[PDB]
From a paper:
Isovaleryl-CoA (coenzyme A) dehydrogenase (IVD) is an intramitochondrial flavoenzyme that catalyzes the conversion of isovaleryl-CoA (3-methylbutyryl-CoA) into 3-methylcrotonyl-CoA in the leucine catabolism pathway, transferring electrons to the electron-transferring flavoprotein (ETF). Consistent with other ACADs, including short-, medium-, and long-chain ACADs, IVD is characterized by a tetrameric architecture composed of 4 identical subunits. Each subunit of IVD contains one noncovalently attached FAD molecule, imparting a characteristic yellow color to the purified enzyme. Dysfunction of IVD is linked to isovaleric acidemia (IVA), a rare metabolic disorder characterized by the accumulation of toxic metabolites.
Author numbering:
A (entry chain B), B (entry chain C), C (entry chain A), D (entry chain D): 6 to 392
The structure:
């Protein structure tokens, strides 16, 4: 259940229960099979249903069918999706915020009018390309070259860790159009890559430890002709978009660990009351009660932090420090919460028949899949040295 | 510098700024001397000045001279007072909540009219008596007998850990009238004693690790004559006012750890830029940046948690489990933040010349004061065994 | 890559390097295959090769083909095998210790001569059957009962969480022979069960999150006619045999967490010296150096702890508190070190191509295997309450 | 009571028993006056008593007045020290390890007969001086210049945080003779200072937060006069001289927090078995049992590590990395163990009538003093990156 402590007003609490019911009747009985087979056969249908329900494009303005609400609604929807299935949560985050937000913020009129109608309804899949095989944290050191020949850009390089790679029809890929600039950041430029262009291909899916079901593969570029009209933002100014969007991406993806540990508690609490030992329920022992108290306090603290930070950005007060800090704290707490939940189940929590094993593997992604904790602490640290 | 992310009204921000301005001029410079001498000669004058500001009865009705504000503003004032001096913060918390807030919720009209105006204007100091030398956590096992004869109650016994003891003019003392009743909880009765009654003798102050300046002494009752009109709550059913006061005292007291963390951050963050090591400022090292990130994230998470829980209580969504959780989390995080703040200073954090040593000793009280930390875990755990 | 701080003798150092060169060509290159297939195809061949080396009966007397060494050599061999493959290490320990030690400490002159030769030689595999589906930590509440049908014992019930179930040829099973005794412990009795006896069978191998490749199943007893000569210990004396072996299995299995915490460091340190970020190797950053230092200090502390506690048990002074404390501390520290070790690889540590995920999944077992992290603290606390 | 599990021989156990029976009724019964007044009335008498037993020369041979034992006996006797009274615990380490052994290991025959026969016999007090206000972490960036005018060096500058300052008769002061050399390590040179030299003076003693009783003040050098024969080591080659005693310091001072943990355990275990709450002793609750288990496991883990490293050091194998790791882990564990011990006492652990707060304030020294944890982590990182 949930409490009104989060300060959720009208049209926000009803959406929570609606998403809960939808994911419990559709997504909840399928998370196990998704994690087992490492694939999601019902991906297109699920995306169509999400587009019809109006959760896709939640942050997009009301011009092409978006909802036009704040980030808090997106945060709670991401939290509920991660609570239902952690693997689908990363894909939803990459689709709704990693791609759509860059299109609605820096995309021009003709640009967003072409892709968003086919992206909000759930037809196209929105992927993002930043990291590279030789640049995980140092995103500004990318080697993807983009030479200019008239009104066409020829990209020749490779990407890695691309969420929803082979399924994405439109991909926001950052390319370094100028490798001779004095600042390394001034050379990168964002381009809208579309499926079906000559010279574009994708590799096989990666076999990850967790998040099994979210497709991820290597991107290959070989003489790919990118039109000049597909540029995002301005030329040689791609850093002012990537750096400004990565904060919102870390902010929205912070709801992931929230829903993960929420599901952890929702699975742990009834088990501690049903399972009995030493003549009584195991949930009455002081150690189990202390663990429950710690997990509940950590979950509530992280949820309130994320919600209060999301409410600030809805009013126009965005900071790079807080967006990284909230997701760092949420992931670092959700890891320990999942460990304690696996511990509370005992031997039964060690087999893959229970979803407790998936919660730990999924919680580890938010520490390395959305920037490492070291980079987050560095971003927070540099925020104080600038005063 | 506090951020607007906390989600406060403009009047609340103005009140916070006014408190910061008032305490910086009158309490912040002499904060170290109060800890060094364990005495506050200007206690009654500072209490009168606070009464002129209306912060003493900030949760009391306006008809008694109070401000009539909610618990959120009370937590704000607590955090602001604890930001300058932790001992004065604890004293204000024991005065405004344990005595003033208790009478407005369970006292009669005459009992309120007699005591509240002087308590709000700073004329009388309030105190609460729950702990005993033989019963610190198990308050139900108190042995203070309160046998009655006619229209007077004959109290006989001693109580320990009484905050603001020697300086309090009106005290709320919980006593046990019927010790032979089968229900151990249904035998307590709250009495409102005052200075001047024959038999009410206070002991000397107690020298403690922190919170120096708060007068704590042992109360001694030897055949005292308490009139039948100074009864708080109902006769032989004082357990309900005792737990109602206990559930709300942990919420307003959470500002103490918040204020201490704010103080240690406002002392550390500037200090890391006016200190040189290896030819550079110590604030530029990645380990110090990680320490700053951890401290800032913990402070922000605890503050948002406490604020969202306090705002929920203003609309009738009160819960003892949430209050115990927030106070436990705030104390546990403030202890670690105070431990880490000393390491940032290096050697300048292990001497009384810097306030970094005082904030650590004061933060330890919140883990053992107003209920033990393990008792909080037990209370939180027992809240799930009834669902 | 180890250091001489352990204080082991020259003979014990030879066994350390002997297994080092053997496991790195026989067990290490196939660890990923065993993990992904969850089936040790060369299980019996590897067991026979280990029996040729004498590491199976390393704690057995030299009369039955053993080695005659102490518990420290067994602990170091277990640590090395767990470093090579944590899944195979658990099976090796649960066979060697939990069979040979239980047989030599409580078996008569005939039972030792009958089973120990082929058990040490590797032809017979051993296992311990104490846990139940309804009793993991509360082993005294077992439901398996035995009834005397003349000079025979008809065992009825089921056993769960047995390592090497379908592979063990000789199994030690505890069965309650009396239920009318006032103490519940006075009814438990130990029996020797061979493979292929009428009424003995295995249901199916279960799948676990970690320790993949170690065969675990459910034991089913359907009117099993165990002879009276197969009783281990004495009549109605199984708990004294069980608790004696329970204290020794915790010390021997402590090398598992030690092995995993050594392997994560042996795989992490050479990785930070290769990958470069921001123009330099990631190993030169302070945030990585601090984590490496913490992991190394934790590993060394746990290793010295286990090695010093092991030496005390060979002299003739063993305690149940230390045996639980060492395994609890080792499991917790190994889990916390693997958590950082996966993060040190960045995105590469989240895929199955690297054994970091396997090391993490195998580390969680020792917190919920061979006892429970909660019950160990209870056993430790009950030691002080008895003094 | 300590057990033989630590790995001590018969002579070492007898030495531990002698220290336990000698420190009582002489030291410990007066650690509360030393803590309250920050003054040792019979410091010189206690030092003379220690000199009669030979603990001051535990590492020095019998030729000069010591006992001729190894560093294991030193780290053992420094655990009994600071156990009865943590205040005087730092003075013994600064006298024996920092001054006596520094002259024994890196001294000539002439200097090995003028000061050491006085220091080992307790007639003189020794101390080391390397830190300064501008260099507390960057020891190679000193500012104290040393100009040569023949056969006498004139020291000019200032130093801070010198242990045993106002009472040491022999002080080893490090000064830079060549402030123009490019390598900072090539300009440092060690010197021997004796009380009563012209230009040398001691400032006011510092009122530290904890460890009150171990004198510490500021050294002022104004046109000093030290003969050339008092140079320790070689001129312009004090790099290896400085960073050789700093390693044995970390190795030997690691027993400091071990004694603090032993003291808080010897004070916590009996108190939990005499204090009753809710009709039962507080030591029987599962939370207090878990706290005792964690404290005991941490103490046993930190104790075996330091002892094994000392055993390895007594044979030729020395490493600064392990010497820093053992003391940093010991301090980090002792802080939490003191926090838990104060938590187990509740209200009584806060007043100054109990040594709970004293042991907490004493434990914080080893984390910031004698080398911060960041310096040790950086040293371990540099040692790992060199290979
Ligand atoms: C959730 C699923 C999807 C994912 O997980 S993908 C996450 C992307 N992958 C990652 O690895 C995380 C990326 N991490 C980072 O980029 C780093 O944190 C970091 C510190 C920004 C690296 O930047 P640096 O190389 O050190 O250079 P820099 O900080 O000076 O930035 C270069 C230019 O960025 C600009 N910038 C930085 N923060 C900004 C902001 N909040 N808004 C707008 N612009 C911003 C900055 O002005 C600078 O401009 P210029 O170079 O001076 O002209
Ligand atoms: C400067 C000011 C700061 C300070 O220093 S204040 C220091 C005083 N703070 C303390 O925490 C004292 C210690 N507190 C405690 O020990 C806890 O209260 C503790 C552990 C729950 C008491 O233990 P128990 O004996 O088990 O009590 P219990 O569970 O049986 O009591 C339940 C009875 O209370 C009653 N109750 C009424 N309103 C309540 C309410 N709003 N919340 C909780 N309980 C409430 C509840 O109905 C129940 O009644 P009944 O006896 O079963 O009939
Ligand atoms: C690959 C993994 C390998 C594995 O085998 S894993 C399975 C390990 N299973 C576990 O359950 C471990 C955790 N549980 C335990 O340790 C015990 O079950 C537990 C809960 C502490 C025992 O508590 P209780 O059930 O209440 O029984 P209890 O403590 O009163 O003891 C009953 C009898 O045991 C006896 N006992 C205990 N330690 C002993 C020793 N070292 N030597 C001889 N006898 C010992 C004790 O004297 C008592 O005797 P009695 O009742 O007077 O007949
Ligand atoms: C003898 C008493 C010791 C004490 O009491 S001090 C504890 C707290 N007080 C302090 O002043 C700070 C403690 N020390 C430090 O923090 C470290 O020295 C510090 C400054 C972080 C290390 O950074 P750096 O300045 O770069 O110095 P460094 O490590 O590169 O060393 C410079 C030269 O020392 C040498 N060195 C280092 N460890 C050594 C060893 N175990 N044995 C012999 N020589 C050693 C190193 O070879 C180097 O010499 P070279 O110039 O390359 O020839
Ligand atoms: C108005 C007021 C003001 C106060 N001000 C102060 C102050 O400023 N400073 C101060 O120090 N104190 C103060 N106190 C006292 C403080 O409230 C008590 O110290 C606190 O409740 C704990 O009490 P105790 O340590 O005496 O209980 P104890 O029972 O002695 O607690 C000792 C230990 O027993 C443990 N314990 C008890 N029951 C259980 C259980 N069921 N399970 C597990 N563990 C258990 C506790 O966790 C604790 O660790 C004040 C009290 C009141 C009423
Ligand atoms: C013989 C001797 C006796 C001593 N006695 C005592 C004693 O009695 N009591 C005591 O408290 N201490 C003692 N010390 C420790 C020493 O005095 C410490 O330096 C003390 O804490 C004084 O600190 P400081 O502020 O001068 O230097 P520091 O402790 O180093 O403080 C400076 C700050 O700069 C930061 N900094 C510097 N470089 C880096 C970096 N690379 N990365 C991150 N941060 C960095 C620090 O970590 C630290 O926060 C003793 C040392 C010696 C050698
Ligand atoms: C040879 C052998 C091999 C095994 N191998 C494996 C293996 O590979 N993997 C595996 O998962 N299991 C294995 N087991 C089973 C393992 O022993 C149990 O999983 C474990 O002891 C407890 O788990 P449970 O869920 O069965 O017990 P439960 O008692 O159901 O544990 C549930 C939770 O209740 C808690 N609890 C119980 N009593 C108390 C109390 N008094 N106070 C506080 N908390 C309490 C426990 O701490 C635990 O957190 C093996 C057993 C044997 C005998
Ligand atoms: C849309 C998109 C989706 C992605 N999806 C996934 C996914 O689903 N799963 C996944 O695993 N990955 C994913 N990635 C990749 C992921 O974002 C990167 O792996 C992440 O930024 C960390 O990169 P790295 O580990 O490769 O960097 P690395 O350099 O490998 O990091 C290794 C270590 O180096 C440390 N380090 C680097 N710089 C510093 C510094 N200055 N100070 C201290 N330490 C440092 C890091 O902190 C880290 O601990 C995705 C990337 C994008 C762009």
């Amino acid at each position: 259940v949930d409490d009104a402590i989060n300060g959720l007003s009208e049209e926000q609490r009803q959406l929570r229960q609606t998403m809960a019911k939808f994911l419990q009747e559709h997504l909840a009985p399928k998370a196990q099979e998704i994690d087992r087979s490492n694939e999601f056969k019902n991906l297109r249908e699920f995306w169509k249903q999400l587009g019809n329900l109006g959760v896709l494009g939640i942050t997009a303005p009301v011009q092409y069918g978006g909802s036009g609400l704040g980030y808090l609604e997106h945060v709670l929807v991401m939290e509920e999706i991660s609570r239902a299935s952690g693997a689908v949560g990363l894909s939803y985050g990459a689709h709704s915020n990693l791609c759509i937000n860059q299109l609605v913020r820096n995309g021009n009129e003709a640009q967003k009018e072409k892709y968003l109608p086919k992206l909000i309804s759930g037809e196209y899949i929105g992927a993002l390309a930043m990291s590279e095989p030789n640049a995980g944290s140092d995103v500004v050191s990318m080697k993807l070259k983009a030479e200019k020949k008239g009104n066409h850009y020829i990209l020749n390089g490779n990407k890695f860790w691309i969420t929803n790679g082979p399924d994405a029809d439109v991909l926001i890929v950052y390319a370094k159009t100028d490798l001779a600039a004095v600042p390394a950041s001034r050379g990168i430029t964002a381009f809208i890559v579309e499926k079906g262009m000559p010279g574009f291909s994708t590799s096989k899916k990666l076999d990850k430890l967790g998040m099994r079901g979210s497709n991820t593969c290597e991107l290959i570029f070989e003489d790919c002709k990118i039109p000049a009209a597909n540029i995002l933002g301005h030329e040689n100014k791609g850093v002012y978009v990537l750096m400004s969007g990565l904060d919102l991406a870390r902010l929205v993806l912070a709801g992931g660990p929230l829903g993960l540990m929420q599901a952890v508690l929702d699975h742990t609490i009834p088990y501690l009351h049903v399972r009995e030992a030493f003549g009584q329920k195991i949930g009455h022992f002081q150690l189990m009660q202390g663990k429950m108290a710690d997990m509940y306090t950590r979950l509530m603290a992280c949820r309130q932090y994320v919600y209060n930070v999301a409410k600030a950005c809805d009013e126009g007060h965005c900071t790079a420090k807080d967006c990284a800090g909230v997701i760092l704290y949420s992931a670092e707490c959700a890891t320990q919460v999942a460990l304690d939940g696996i511990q509370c189940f005992g031997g039964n929590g060690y087999i893959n028949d229970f979803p407790m094993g998936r919660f730990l593997r999924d919680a580890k992604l938010y520490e390395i899949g959305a920037g490492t904790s070291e980079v987050r602490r560095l971003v927070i640290g540099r925020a104080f040295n600038a005063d």
